[PDB]
Each structure stands twice: as C-alpha cells, then as structure tokens.
Enzyme design. Structure first.
Site, PDB file in Angstrom:
ATOM      1  CG  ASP A 268      -6.221  -3.736   1.039  1.00 19.57           C
ATOM      2  OD1 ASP A 268      -5.598  -4.378   0.169  1.00 19.57           O
ATOM      3  OD2 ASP A 268      -5.868  -3.697   2.236  1.00 19.57           O
TER       4      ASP A 268
ATOM      5  CG  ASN B 217       2.245  -1.360   3.595  1.00 16.22           C
ATOM      6  OD1 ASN B 217       2.241  -0.327   2.924  1.00 16.22           O
ATOM      7  ND2 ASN B 217       1.393  -2.360   3.378  1.00 16.22           N
TER       8      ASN B 217
ATOM      9  CB  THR C 222      -0.939  -0.021   1.210  1.00 20.51           C
ATOM     10  OG1 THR C 222      -1.792  -1.169   1.127  1.00 20.51           O
ATOM     11  CG2 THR C 222      -1.797   1.236   1.273  1.00 20.51           C
TER      12      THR C 222
HETATM   13  C1  LIG Z   1      -5.460   0.205   6.081  1.00 19.20           C
HETATM   14  N1  LIG Z   1      -5.814  -0.818   5.098  1.00 19.20           N
HETATM   15  C2  LIG Z   1      -5.780  -2.141   5.711  1.00 19.20           C
HETATM   16  C3  LIG Z   1      -7.193  -0.588   4.683  1.00 19.20           C
HETATM   17  C4  LIG Z   1      -4.993  -0.791   3.885  1.00 19.20           C
HETATM   18  C5  LIG Z   1      -3.465  -0.803   4.097  1.00 19.20           C
HETATM   19  O1  LIG Z   1      -3.049  -1.977   4.736  1.00 19.20           O
HETATM   20  P1  LIG Z   1      -2.251  -3.140   3.879  1.00 19.20           P
HETATM   21  O2  LIG Z   1      -3.071  -4.410   3.881  1.00 19.20           O
HETATM   22  O3  LIG Z   1      -2.017  -2.695   2.450  1.00 19.20           O
HETATM   23  O4  LIG Z   1      -0.919  -3.407   4.544  1.00 19.20           O
HETATM   24 ZN   LIG Z   2      -3.114  -1.293  -0.566  1.00 18.97          ZN
HETATM   25 ZN   LIG Z   3      -3.804  -4.723   2.020  1.00 15.16          ZN
END
Ligand SMILES: C[N+](C)(C)CCOP(=O)(O)O
Ligand SMILES: [Zn+2]
Ligand SMILES: [Zn+2]
Ligand SMILES: *[C@@H]1O[C@H](CO)[C@@H](O[C@@H]2O[C@H](CO)[C@@H](O[C@@H]3O[C@H](CO)[C@@H](O)[C@H](O)[C@@H]3O)[C@H](O)[C@H]2NC(C)=O)[C@H](O)[C@H]1NC(C)=O
Ligand SMILES: *[C@@H]1O[C@H](CO[C@@H]2O[C@@H](C)[C@@H](O)[C@@H](O)[C@@H]2O)[C@@H](O[C@@H]2O[C@H](CO)[C@@H](O)[C@H](O)[C@H]2NC(C)=O)[C@H](O)[C@H]1NC(C)=O
Ligand SMILES: *[C@@H]1O[C@H](CO)[C@@H](O[C@@H]2O[C@H](CO)[C@@H](O)[C@H](O)[C@H]2NC(C)=O)[C@H](O)[C@H]1NC(C)=O
Ligand SMILES: *[C@@H]1O[C@H](CO)[C@@H](O[C@@H]2O[C@H](CO)[C@@H](O)[C@H](O)[C@H]2NC(C)=O)[C@H](O)[C@H]1NC(C)=O
Ligand SMILES: *[C@@H]1O[C@H](CO)[C@@H](O)[C@H](O)[C@H]1NC(C)=O
Ligand code: NA
Length: 388
Positions: free
Chosen positions: A170, A67, A46
């Site tokens: 996501d 991240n 992300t």
């Molecule tokens: C905050 N989120 C879980 C919605 C997206 C970012 O977290 P990630 O799963 O990409 O590490």
């Molecule tokens: Zn993401």
């Molecule tokens: Zn994610």
C-alpha cells in the site's frame, strides 16, 4: 485442533501478481486455494475493511466507518495511527474474532493488525503488538523478525490464532503508483516473504497443524495528475464553507459533511450537480448496495468520486500517485484471497466473493461459535476438505 494464521498485505490488488514473477504465490496456489479476486467492503479503507475481516460485518454494522476517528461535536479528527489506540472507535457494539475465540477457551494474538491493540468490553487480546508513529513498513529484515515472533507465539505461548499485518504494498502504491516499477519490486519482496512464511511454518513442525490465509483489504488505482477536471470544492460557485459545521475532505475519494443548523438543503442543492464525477447523497439516499451509510456515525451528507479522482476541499494538499477508497465494484479495488493448510483443498480456484464471508470461514477453521454477522459460511465452505 488446527491453528489459524491470517496475514494481510495492505493494498494488494487482485492482479498485482500477474505482471510480476511470484514463485511462492504460484506454489501456494498449487498447494492451496485461491479466489479469482475478492470484493472488499465499501468504503475501501484500511481500517473499515480490516475490521470487516475480523467481524464478518459490513462497515455500516460494525461502526468503524473511517480510518480516522472523528467527532462532529468536538471537531477532533485523528489520523490512522492515532485511531489504532482509540478504544471507543472499535468497541462500538461488535466483537472481533480475537475476543470471540478467547471467550471460548482459545488464545489469540494481533501483530500490527488494525483494531488489535485495544480492549473490547474489558477484554484484551492475549498477545498484541502495535507499531510506532514513524514506523517503516518496507524493511524486509523487520518483516522476517515479526514472523519469527509470531511463530514463537504459536509454539511457546500456546496461541491458536494470530492476525499479522503488513503495510506494503500500500505505502509504495500510494507514493509511486500501482503500475510503477517500485510497486513490482515491493510485490517481489512480498513473495519472498510468503516463501519465508511457509518455510517458517515447516521449520516449526506446523505444516499439518496450521491453516494459513493470505489476503488484503483493497486494491489501488492511479491518480492521473494530468487530468484537468479536478474535483475542487474551492471552485464550486454556489458552495461556501461558511455553511459547514464539520468536514472530512482531502482524504482520497471519500468525503463527509455536517452543515450548520438549517443549511442542509442549501448545501445539498449546490453540491448535487457541482461536478459530474462527484456523487453527493443525503445519508438516507446513499445506495444500499454499499452497506455503508446506515450508521449513526455517518454524517447527513457523504460523497464519493469516480475512479482516479480525489476530493479537494478548501485547497489541494493531496499528491499520492495511487489511491484507494473508490467504488468496490471497480476492478482496480478488488483484492486477493489465498489459503493453504490441512483443512484446505489444493489446486482450487473459486469465483469471486465479498470479504464479508472470511469471518465465517475463520470461525469454522477454529471450531468456535461465530457472532451473528452479515456473512454466510456456505460461500467459502467449498474451500475445505470434507471430514470423514
Ligand atoms: C499505514 N499504511 C499507510 C501502510 C496503510 C494504512 O494507511 P491508508 O493509506 O490505508 O490510510
Ligand atoms: Zn489499506
Ligand atoms: Zn492506503
Ligand atoms: C498494545 O501493544 C503494545 C505493544 O506495542 C502492548 O504493550 C506490551 O504489553 C506486553 C504485555 O503487557 C508487555 O510485555 C511484558 O513486558 C514485561 C517487561 O518487558 C515482561 O515482564 C512481561 O513478561 C511481558 O513480556 C510489553 O512490554 C508491552 N510493550 C509496550 C511497548 O507497551 C500493549 O499491551 C497492547 N495493548 C493492548 C490493549 O492490547
Ligand atoms: C531494518 O530492520 C532491522 C531490524 O531491526 C531490529 O529488529 C526489529 C524487529 C525491531 O523490533 C528492533 O528490535 C531492531 O531495530 C534493523 O537491523 C538492526 O539494526 C540495528 C542498528 O540500527 C542493529 O544494532 C541490529 O543488530 C540490527 N538487527 C538485525 C537483525 O540486523 C535495520 O537497521 C533496519 N534497516 C532499516 C534501513 O530500517
Ligand atoms: C464527542 O465530543 C463531544 C464534545 O466534547 C463530547 O461531549 C462531551 O462529553 C462529555 C463526557 O463525555 C460531557 O461531560 C460534556 O458535557 C460533553 N460536551 C458537549 C459540548 O456535549 C462527546 O462525549 C464526544 N464523544 C465521543 C464518543 O468521543
Ligand atoms: C457507538 O458509537 C456511537 C458514536 O460514536 C455512540 O452513539 C452515541 O450515543 C450517545 C448515547 O449513547 C449519544 O449521546 C450520542 O449522540 C451518540 N452519537 C452518535 C454519533 O450517534 C453509540 O452509543 C456507540 N454504541 C456502542 C454500542 O458503543
Ligand atoms: C448557482 O446558483 C445561481 C442561483 O440560482 C444559478 O443562477 C447558477 O446557475 C448556479 N450555478 C451552478 C453552477 O449551479
Ligand atoms: Na506472477
């Protein structure tokens, strides 16, 4: 000049709209531009991919290589939300678009966008909002409220640029899987927001004055728990965590390792063939096509696993039904790029391109001098009208 609104729905796979009724996205495709799919940067995380969108650089070049903020000397590893406030992680020699635009007379804002709540060389974003630690990312009423705020930034705070972030689909894709009915319900919610977004642009008399980009950072793929040949470090016979000084595993299909002094060869020769679906490299030998490994923050050993397989370290602690982070050549990792506005043509579909090129486009749309970056404006310039 025209204002710019970049919107990101986290983890929106390139084809999530193909098996869902998405009237507002279909209409936006009629009225604007659409890529068949967009190839994200690797790693497909992300924060790295979002910082690519606002710098025009591959991940190895802007420095946000994970991240999680981490420091091999201190052993600190901070989760995603905490890293959003670690200034040194993002301000590592590259300048995001908010700052470039503000140094040239513009006012820019970030709403929940990764990297948008820290200063860069002492400069802060004109308007910045960051969510709480236990934020709920799927409250539709809260979404509309945030859009209302963003519209106020444009009209009452004289902002020229805003980057707005949403944490769905996501979150739902992770919990229930990208093929689940819950995901499709969340994509229907996204589509109702796209309509509300355009409805709010028109109410504020900005249709002919504001360019809108709707994109995302990566896709999503199913993690099959039924599979039996799991990638488990704790079942590698010749490997031992006694040889490791720092580790970053149990975080999807991407792993990093810093062996103790003098044990690199021992650790490497053990892991290079430990599992046919785990690809372990010395930092120097990692494939260049990923544009990821050549950064000082990357550890001497890094690895990635095949689609649908995560990396388990000392013990299995992962339970998501869907994951990302896999090879950006895999179709399931591809994502979307949609745009509409006075500068954009209508009814146009373009062939795929790498997300590294969005930055150059946004600078042209804002009429500002771009920082040196890894993209080329000629890639997306066919999207725009020819001036007369
Ligand atoms: C905050 N989120 C879980 C919605 C997206 C970012 O977290 P990630 O799963 O990409 O590490
Ligand atoms: Zn993401
Ligand atoms: Zn994610
Ligand atoms: C990171 O995001 C946070 C928000 O989550 C930013 O904090 C907010 O900063 C603004 C501007 O400094 C504050 O607004 C001001 O509020 C006071 C009192 O309400 C008012 O007098 C001013 O007119 C202005 O509206 C806001 O209160 C504040 N909120 C919180 C929770 O801190 C922060 O600035 C961002 N940081 C960076 C580096 O961008
Ligand atoms: C879903 O979110 C709404 C909105 O929350 C408000 O606005 C957000 C943008 C946030 O910044 C806060 O200011 C607010 O909490 C919630 O609706 C509010 O709920 C409270 C009760 O908890 C009520 O007093 C307010 O009047 C409500 N506001 C509106 C506009 O309806 C709602 O509770 C959230 N629901 C869930 C399940 O999370
Ligand atoms: C990463 O962690 C190391 C370990 O704490 C940090 O090194 C210390 O840095 C401070 C000042 O930054 C020095 O006063 C200490 O002497 C250092 N200690 C050691 C053991 O080297 C380092 O600064 C951290 N780096 C980042 C970017 O956070
Ligand atoms: C970007 O971050 C890296 C690491 O977070 C910085 O590299 C460190 O630089 C100091 C001295 O400048 C060294 O003592 C450390 O050993 C370096 N660490 C690593 C991992 O290389 C780098 O200086 C930062 N660059 C900018 C422009 O901020
Ligand atoms: C582990 O190392 C020993 C020592 O050479 C070797 O005999 C054995 O085949 C190795 N096993 C694996 C799975 O690599
Ligand atoms: Na559809």
């Amino acid at each position: 000049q025209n204002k710019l609104l970049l919107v990101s729905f986290d983890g929106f796979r390139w084809n999530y709209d193909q098996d869902v009724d998405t009237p507002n996205l279909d209409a936006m495709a009629r009225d604007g531009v659409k890529a068949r799919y967009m190839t994200p940067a690797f790693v497909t995380m992300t924060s790295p991919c979002h910082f690519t969108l606002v710098t025009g650089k591959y991940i190895e070049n802007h420095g946000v290589v994970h991240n999680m903020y981490y420091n091999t000397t201190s052993k600190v590893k901070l989760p995603y939300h905490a890293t959003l406030g670690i200034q040194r992680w993002w301000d590592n020699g590259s300048v995001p678009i908010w700052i470039t635009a503000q140094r040239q007379g513009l006012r820019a804002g970030s709403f929940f966008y990764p990297g948008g709540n820290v200063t860069y060389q002492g400069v802060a974003v004109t308007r910045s909002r960051k969510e709480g630690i236990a934020h709920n990312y799927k409250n539709e009423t809260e979404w509309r409220a945030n859009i209302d705020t963003v519209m106020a930034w444009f009209t009452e705070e004289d902002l020229d640029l805003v980057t707005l972030y949403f944490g769905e689909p996501d979150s739902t894709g992770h919990r229930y899987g990208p093929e689940s009915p819950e995901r499709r319900e969340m994509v229907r919610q996204v589509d109702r927001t796209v309509g509300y977004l355009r409805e709010s642009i028109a109410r504020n008399h900005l249709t002919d004055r504001l360019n809108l980009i709707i994109t995302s950072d990566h896709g999503m793929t199913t993690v099959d728990k039924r599979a039996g040949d799991l990638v488990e470090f704790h079942k590698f016979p010749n490997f031992t965590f006694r040889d490791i000084e720092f580790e970053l595993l149990d975080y999807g299909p991407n792993g990093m390792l810093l062996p103790k002094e003098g044990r690199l060869e021992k650790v490497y020769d053990a892991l290079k063939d430990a599992h046919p679906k785990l690809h372990v490299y010395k930092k120097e030998a990692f494939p260049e096509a990923f544009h990821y490994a050549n950064n000082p923050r990357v550890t001497p050993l890094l690895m990635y696993s095949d689609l649908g397989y995560v990396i388990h370290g000392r013990i299995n602690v992962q339970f998501n039904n869907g994951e990302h982070g896999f090879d950006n050549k895999d179709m399931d990792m591809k994502t979307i790029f949609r745009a509409v506005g006075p500068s954009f043509r209508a009814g146009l579909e373009v062939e795929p391109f790498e997300s590294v090129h969005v930055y150059e486009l946004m600078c042209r749309l804002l009429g500002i001098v771009p920082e040196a970056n890894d993209g080329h404006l000629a890639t997306l310039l066919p999207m725009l009208h020819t001036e007369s």
